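Anyone have tokens for deoxyribose phosphate aldolase? Sequence:
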Amino acid sequence: ATLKASSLRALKLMHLATTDENVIALCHQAKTPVGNTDAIFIYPRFIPIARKTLKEQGTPEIRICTSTNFPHGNDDIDIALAETRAAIAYGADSVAVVFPYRALMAGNEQVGFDLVKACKEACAAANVLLAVIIETGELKDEALIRKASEISIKAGADNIVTSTGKVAVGATPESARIMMEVIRDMGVEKTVGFIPVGGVRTAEDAQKYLAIADELFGADWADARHYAFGASASLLASLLKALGH
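Reply: yep, here.
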């Protein structure tokens, strides 16, 4: 019941991930006997069918998140932006664009800034939030992790995100802490949230991830707008099991 209280908390912070059939089932999985995940995360094309299914089962407040420049994080701005504009036209509540991390690793900090800033202008124009996935498991270095997060934040990111879930290494407690300390060190905790993708597998993992946030900013900071678990139904069935379900 410290574990049950934080399990419930984490369940409601979930951005539940994973065909028309799979996405429909996903929406039904997001609606649980103890409450609803905050959102789902799906490919842009599935947004209209998801919106409808979520509307039908009585859960229109469950948000729909999606990804662009994904999963590779290439450095073509116009492609990243056209993808982001389509995501919006589909009805996304937020878009996770992949930061051009290879470009930053080959010494180019400016293309990450321009790219994030172009997708942010599109999203803000439509009242859509922009998340930025820096892909910590590829950047690897603490210094590059800070750097990608700071550029993202200056370019207007609303949320910074560890990972795509598509490479070998997702979130670790250490990359999570580095990224949140950038939010702290720039003093932008009102305007910027955080999302670990990968690395959270169990109810006990989630509890530990939130405790980093609570210790950094206080226990009120991590609210639906400022913290999400970018995760699948294994985390969810863990969280629910921890609740007697």
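The first strand starts at residue 14 and ends at 17.
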